[PDB]
Amino acid sequence: RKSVLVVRHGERVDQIFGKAWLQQCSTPDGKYYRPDLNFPCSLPRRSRGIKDFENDPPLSSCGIFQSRIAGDALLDSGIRISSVFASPALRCVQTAKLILEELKLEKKIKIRVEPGIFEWTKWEAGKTTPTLMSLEELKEANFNIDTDYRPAFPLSALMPAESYQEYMDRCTASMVQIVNTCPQDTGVILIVSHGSTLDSCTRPLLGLPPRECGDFAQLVRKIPSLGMCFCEENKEEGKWELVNPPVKTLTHGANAAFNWRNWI
Amino acid sequence: ARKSVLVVRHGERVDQIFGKAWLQQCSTPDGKYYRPDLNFPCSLPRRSRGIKDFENDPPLSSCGIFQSRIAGDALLDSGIRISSVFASPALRCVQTAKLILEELKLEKKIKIRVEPGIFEWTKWEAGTPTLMSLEELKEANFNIDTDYRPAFPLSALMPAESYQEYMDRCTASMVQIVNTCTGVILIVSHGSTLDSCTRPLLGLPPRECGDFAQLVRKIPSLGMCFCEENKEEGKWELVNPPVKTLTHGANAAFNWRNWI
Numbered sequence: 001r002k003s004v005l006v007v008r009h010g011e012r013v014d015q016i017f018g019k020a021w022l023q024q025c026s027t028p029d030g031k032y033y034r035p036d037l038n039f040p041c042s043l044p045r046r047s048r049g050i051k052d053f054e055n056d057p058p059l060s061s062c063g064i065f066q067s068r069i070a071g072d073a074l075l076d077s078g079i080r081i082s083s084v085f086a087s088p089a090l091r092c093v094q095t096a097k098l099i100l101e102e103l104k105l106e107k108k109i110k111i112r113v114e115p116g117i118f119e120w121t122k123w124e125a126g127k128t129t130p131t132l133m134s135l136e137e138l139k140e141a142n143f144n145i146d147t148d149y150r151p152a153f154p155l156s157a158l159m160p161a162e163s164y165q166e167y168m169d170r171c172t173a174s175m176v177q178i179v180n181t182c183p184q185d186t187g188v189i190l191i192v193s194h195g196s197t198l199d200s201c202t203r204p205l206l207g208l209p210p211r212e213c214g215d216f217a218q219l220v221r222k223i224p225s226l227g228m229c230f231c232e233e234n235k236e237e238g239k240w241e242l243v244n245p246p247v248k249t250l251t252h253g254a255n256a257a258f259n260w261r262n263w264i
Numbered sequence: 265a266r267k268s269v270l271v272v273r274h275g276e277r278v279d280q281i282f283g284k285a286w287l288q289q290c291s292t293p294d295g296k297y298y299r300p301d302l303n304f305p306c307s308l309p310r311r312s313r314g315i316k317d318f319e320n321d322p323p324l325s326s327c328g329i330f331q332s333r334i335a336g337d338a339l340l341d342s343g344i345r346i347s348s349v350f351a352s353p354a355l356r357c358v359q360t361a362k363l364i365l366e367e368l369k370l371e372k373k374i375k376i377r378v379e380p381g382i383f384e385w386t387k388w389e390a391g392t393p394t395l396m397s398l399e400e401l402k403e404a405n406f407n408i409d410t411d412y413r414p415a416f417p418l419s420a421l422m423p424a425e426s427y428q429e430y431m432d433r434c435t436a437s438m439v440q441i442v443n444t445c446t447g448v449i450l451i452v453s454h455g456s457t458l459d460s461c462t463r464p465l466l467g468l469p470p471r472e473c474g475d476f477a478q479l480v481r482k483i484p485s486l487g488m489c490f491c492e493e494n495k496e497e498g499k500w501e502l503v504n505p506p507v508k509t510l511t512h513g514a515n516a517a518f519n520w521r522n523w524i
Contacts, residue, residue: 016513037334037510062512065330069302199523219522224515229523242523249517250302252327253281255484257511262479263459263489263502 002186002233004205005246006198007070009087009095010063010225013039019125022054036257038062044090044141046133055130056090059098063225066250067095070226071102073247081105082187085112085178087194088132088155089119095226096192097143110146112181113138116153116174117201119194120167121160128160152177168210171200179205188246195220198229205231205240226250265345267493269441269465270506271451271458272335274352274360275328275485278304287319301517303327309355309404311396320390324359328485331510332360335486336367338507346370347447350377352454353395353418354384360486361452362406375409377444381416381437382461384454385430391423415440427473430456435464455483465491465500486510 014021016038025032025039030049032042038061046052059067074081081103086096093111100106113135121128132155135145152174159166178189178201191201199216203209210216228245279286281303290297290304295315297308303325308315324332339346346368351361358376365371378398386393395418401408415437438461441449451461459476463469470476488505 011513011515016511034508037338037508038512060512061334061510062330065327065334066515069326069330073302202523222516222518222522224518226515227518229520242520245520248299248302250326250515251281251517252303252325252515253276253485254514255276255331255486255510255512256482257509258482258484258487260489260502260505262482263462 002189002235003243004189004191004202004231004240006191006193006201006229007095007099008195008198008223008225008227009059009089009091009192010066010098011060012057012063012091013060014057016060016062021057022050026050040064044133044137046137052131052133053090055125056132059091059094063091063095064098066225067098068102070247070250071099074099075103077246079246080187081109081190082185083112083182084109084190084192085114085117086192087118087197088113088115089194090133092192092194093133093138093143096190099190099192100144106144110144110149112146112149112151112178114149114151114153114174114178115155115158116151116170116177117191117193117197118155118158120164120196121158121162122164122167123196126160129155129158149181164213164216165210167196168200168203171197172204175201175204195223195227198223198227202229202231202242206242207239224250265446267446267449267495268503269449269451269462269491269500270344270346271453271461271489272360272364273455273458273483273485273487274324274354274356274452275331275335275363276325277322277328277356278325279322281325286322287315291315303515305329309396309406311400311404313400317394317396318355320393321355321395323355324363328356328360329363331486332363333367335507335510336364339364340368342506344506345447346374346450348377348445349374349450349452350379350382350441351452352383352457353378353380354454355396357452357454358396358401358406361450364450364452365407371407375407375412377409377412377414379412379414379416379437379441380418380421381414381433381440382451382453382457383421385427385456386421386423386425387427387430388456389423392419392421412444427476428470431460431463431470434460437461438464455480455487458483458487458489462489462491462502466502467499484510
């Protein structure tokens with residue numbers, strides 16, 4: 001039974017360590033270090049050193065954990081993943097890769113990067129698209145990217161401070177392209193993206209117009225890291241329906257910092 | 265390269281997230297284990313007597329496993345040498361100790377010395393407490409040191425002990441711990457342990473209870489306290505822990521039916 005599984009990326013470092021996270025993990029000469037264990041072990045190599053990560057931040061160590069444990073659960077559920085699409089955000093592509101590794105499909109399935117499902121530009125740093133990693137850079141960072149895939153949109157088409165309606169229209173238009181890419185295929189089309197994507201990419205499949213922005217927003221507030229929305233196609237009736245996701249929720253506590261000097 | 269004591273708090277325990285009846289949420293009517301949420305661990309430890317006893321001796325959450333692993337991973341990088349390992353008999357502590365050892369690649373080399381004397385203050389537990397026996401731990405694939413004679417046995421832990429009575433058995437245990445066997449002694453235990461087991465090393469008397477408790481509130485999962493021995497001066501001193509802090513956010517449950 002053909003289906004689409006939309007998945008929110010794992011915890012992003014700047015969610016915890018704030019908008020200036022990069023300044024906390026950078027030396028004067030622009031080199032990386034971990035001031036806290038939730039900063040990732042390393043950062044992949046990128047053109048202008050590590051400058052361009054500032055608004056395209058990686059997963060935290062926790063976000064890696066979340067991604068891995070969800071992927072492990074997807075393996076155990078037994079469902080078949082036929083393809084994987086991803087927002088060009090590094091956090092989303094990183095989440096895609098970690099899931100594929102746990103499924104043992106990292107070498108068999110390439111990631112199709114689709115700038116058309118990038119986050120609503122109203123919710124980004126400068127109310128605009130940041131510098132993202134090139135596909136050449138992702139290959140060099142050992143991501144198995146599908147360079148033959150012709151995406152619905154280039155990143156440059158994404159308007160800064162686009163309206164709610166414009167954001168929904170480009171996600172809808174992207175979901176036309178996504179479904180038509182290998183249409184015979186049954187199996188799960190995995191889409192690893194942002195919170196908003198759970199609604200923006202499933203609505204058009206269900207034959208529904210966008211929600212009122214308010215209701216959309218309230219619904220997105222509640223999507224946790226690696227939250228999922230699952231839609232199955234009923235082939236006979238030519239119709240899609242929302243379904244219980246193939247894995248359970250993931251619920252855990254925070255962990256605060258401590259200052260050892262307090263003991264003195 | 266001095267002698268030292270690294271005290272580490274266990275990772276996230278499942279019941280801190282899923283409450284006191286966590287066992288009833290992951291148990292079938294006929295007593296088999298299932299995972300209602302992914303933060304419940306992959307499995308409970310192989311125990312033959314059944315799952316009933318875990319209720320008040322809860323294991324690490326998935327997050328707790330992650331926390332333990334990433335902490336142990338960083339200890340390996342720091343390049344310090346762990347020579348022995350002591351652990352509170354609570355499963356969560358022993359589990360954290362195994363996970364750290366695995367990351368240090370010493371799970372086969374160093375046996376875990378279970379010391380009931382550094383168990384949690386019994387005023388902060390349910391009510392003797394219902395733990396896994398050393399044979400049950402061995403059975404569950406834990407590399408325990410059965411030869412070890414502990415300063416305190418499981419039976420000695422009486423309910424509703426006083427603050428002072430808890431401090432006394434911790435200092436008493438630290439006397440022993442120091443004598444048994446110049447690498448790092450690892451103590452994987454509870455939040456309270458970071459203070460209760462380091463004060464006597466430094467030669468300090470117990471804190472006032474309130475000062476103690478106020479300090480224990482602030483100790484996160486995998487939190488550490490590190491004392492180095494100055495052999496020349498015959499004195500111990502607190503030192504910056506060998507690995508960094510671990511700060512991360514929470515994750516809430518979502519209900520997919522909200523989308524319909």
